Design a protein around this ligand. Sequence first.
Ligand SMILES: [Zn+2]
Length: 258
Amino acid sequence: HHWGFGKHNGPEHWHKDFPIAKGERQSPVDIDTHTAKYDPSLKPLSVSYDQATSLRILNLGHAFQVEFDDSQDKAVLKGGPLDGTYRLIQFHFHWGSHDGQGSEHTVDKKKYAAELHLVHWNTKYGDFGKAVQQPDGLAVLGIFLKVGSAKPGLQKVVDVLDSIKTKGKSADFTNFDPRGLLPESLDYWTYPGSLTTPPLLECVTWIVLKEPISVSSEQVSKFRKLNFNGEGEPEEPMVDNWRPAQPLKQRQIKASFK
Ligand SMILES: [Zn+2]
């Protein structure tokens, strides 16, 4: 009964193995735009992906992840609410069983068709594993996906997914430029929170972009053809791998805009 997104092992059950699931700094959250606070002191984000080096793409079971060479010192997220520099290690998505749900963060309760997380670790701490043990260990850039026109910079991802249908499969995924996954504007909300899969560690500065990227119905539908199961096991399509919004509790969501 490893955690996952079935009826028996899904988000409602995670607290039994990971009691921090009911903790004080859990993610995702609903972003209530009336109660979020515009902070004029929040500076622009700095996302430098020019020299990011993608390596491989893996079906981990609950989702797929594209991994990067985080020995590169130039593929970095910094600025914004951050007081350090953070190296890109991987990205992945969350999505639904239909276009009407799939995002983890919500905006005034609005759910998007999917959400992209670009995960970066703090260069103060040596590596990812050591970083997640610190309250400022990770900076995750979250980006909503809505269905409309196609996102060209996502196509290489969409095209490869048929090769990694079942858990444990992977593919070469070199020369992928994650700049192609960013919207035009980098206006953002930000708050302190957690990983949204177990172990749910409270080590993340969340930066959630106001502007969603547009992806086509065809592109997001490919996500739903992935499987949670391993090869030869009964087919279980990989859908609804999003943790729902958790209580904000003490925290203050801040915005770079009104
Ligand atoms: Zn995520």
